[PDB]
Ligand binder design. Structure first.
Ligand SMILES: [Ca+2]
Ligand SMILES: [Ca+2]
Ligand SMILES: [Ca+2]
Ligand SMILES: [Ca+2]
Ligand SMILES: [Ca+2]
Ligand SMILES: [Ca+2]
Ligand SMILES: [Ca+2]
Ligand SMILES: [Zn+2]
Length: 469
């Protein structure tokens, strides 16, 4: 396959919405999913009151063991230090993406959101079957609002030890989601008490898209390698930003995600090949980098909004929220596909045989070691006055892929190299400056005397060996 083939594949990964069908189910857009996840229309600001900020209190009540909660469970207890630590990280991950402020109050004081353990379904009888539950805002029961109560079965090791068992951390984030107004992404009525993914309302009801889902990411072709996302995923972000607005203050500086991270978030960071990230990135400003340099797997990194990447040997485990511009990407030692966006991007392949695609804007492309391919598919990819730079081209090793153009023209003779321009569309001209070590690649795509495409290349280029046309 050409570099362009790989780029095209990654660009059309997890297409959604616009009425298409997936797995025999309706596909929802990110926006549609956010609305459906919030279909109960309940918020802490009121019924059908959307887009407004909120300040909420939370606490860890000192629940009495022989007490019985509103759901009929007993053997209650206070959250441990470990549970409190992880719950606070889950709270923060919601506050990162929407205009929610969380403030802890004392155990005995009235709080909007509470956390408690249960262990028995009736006195003296331990429950090994259930996991957790919570009540949405404005859930009125016997005249009282249950909204904000969250409850967890501490017999489950993941609930007891969420710092080392990542399903426990996901469960905290999930139940807080309910406490904020999110539902499961379907009611699964057709399942009649024994539901499966076959009972979803829309195809993207999986853990690839929402941690409010219980269905495996594999149902949509994801693969999280046995791990569970700690923090709100792509459609969760749409849902909670619908409810309380997008947080425009978050990570507005120059932010590095992955290796060498300055996020100060465990779920956005890694320090080793074995530590696998799973996240949907929310970022409100600055010049940002997806640094996946420390992974050995073949990776696919897409810097477009709402798009999915294959990172660290997982599939569809990294994504970028709607409205977010991520500028730079760094691949690992594997054979990577790296696709930029309309902004100026710095793309670095690292070792391995990589495919780089800058797209629009003035991009800076580093193949690194290996046999790399730099792909172009529009004049606007590298317009005179905003040219791409390929900063480390090695003749006889790297390649420039212009194959899109002759495929589109259905002609082997559209793109062709000449020693001088004539005005004929398709002409390509190489000009080598041995003094500066820079080669110019100019192409007349649109059919004018002045070329409308100019790539600047550090290094010699051998026309006989270095192109895919
Ligand atoms: Ca940033
Ligand atoms: Ca940015
Ligand atoms: Ca690489
Ligand atoms: Ca770009
Ligand atoms: Ca490389
Ligand atoms: Ca290279
Ligand atoms: Ca470009
Ligand atoms: Zn739930």
């Amino acid at each position: 396959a050409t570099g362009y083939d790989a780029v095209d594949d990654l660009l059309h990964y997890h297409e959604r919405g616009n009425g298409i069908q997936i797995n025999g189910k309706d596909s929802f857009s990110n926006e549609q999913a956010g609305l459906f996840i919030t279909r109960e229309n309940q918020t802490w600001n009121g019924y059908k009151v959307f887009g407004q900020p909120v300040k909420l209190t939370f606490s860890f009540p000192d629940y009495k063991f022989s007490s019985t909660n509103v759901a009929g469970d007993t053997g209650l207890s206070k959250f441990s230090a470990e549970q409190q630590q992880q719950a606070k990280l889950s709270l923060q991950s919601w506050a990162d993406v929407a205009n929610i402020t969380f403030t802890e109050v004392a155990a005995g004081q009235k709080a909007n959101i509470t956390f408690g353990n249960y262990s028995q379904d009736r006195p003296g009888h331990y429950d090994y079957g259930t996991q957790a539950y919570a009540f949405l805002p404005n859930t009125i029961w016997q005249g009282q609002d249950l909204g904000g109560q969250t409850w967890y079965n501490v017999n489950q090791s993941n609930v007891k030890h969420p710092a080392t068992e990542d399903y426990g951390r996901q469960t905290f984030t999930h139940e807080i989601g309910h406490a904020l107004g999110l539902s499961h992404p379907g009611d699964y009525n057709a399942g009649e008490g024994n539901p499966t993914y076959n009972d979803v309302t829309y195809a993207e009801d999986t853990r690839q898209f929402s941690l409010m889902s219980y269905w495996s990411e594999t149902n949509t072709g994801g693969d999280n390698g046995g791990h569970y996302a700690a923090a709100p995923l792509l459609d969760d972000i749409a849902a909670i930003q619908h409810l309380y607005g997008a947080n425009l203050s978050t990570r507005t500086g120059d932010t590095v995600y992955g290796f060498n991270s300055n996020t100060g978030r465990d779920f956005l960071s890694t320090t080793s090949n074995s530590q696998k990230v799973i996240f949907a990135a929310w970022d409100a400003g600055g010049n940002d980098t997806f640094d996946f340099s420390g992974y050995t797997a073949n990776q696919r990194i897409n810097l477009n909004e709402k798009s999915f990447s294959d990172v660290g040997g997982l599939k569809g485990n990294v994504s970028i929220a709607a409205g977010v511009t991520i500028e730079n990407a760094i691949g690992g030692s594997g054979n990577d596909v790296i696709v930029g966006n309309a902004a100026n991007n710095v793309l670095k392949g690292g070792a391995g045989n990589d495919v780089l695609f800058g797209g629009g804007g003035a991009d800076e492309l580093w193949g690194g070691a290996g046999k790399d391919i730099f792909v172009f598919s529009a004049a606007s990819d590298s317009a005179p006055g905003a040219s791409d730079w390929i900063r480390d081209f090695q003749k006889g090793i790297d390649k420039i892929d212009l194959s899109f153009f002759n495929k589109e023209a259905n002609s082997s003779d559209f793109i062709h190299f000449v020693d001088h321009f004539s005005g004929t569309a398709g002409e390509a001209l190489l000009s080598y400056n041995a003094s500066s070590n820079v080669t110019d690649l100019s192409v007349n795509i649109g059919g004018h005397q002045a070329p409308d495409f100019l790539v600047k290349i550090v290094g010699q280029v051998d026309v006989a060996t270095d192109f895919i046309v």
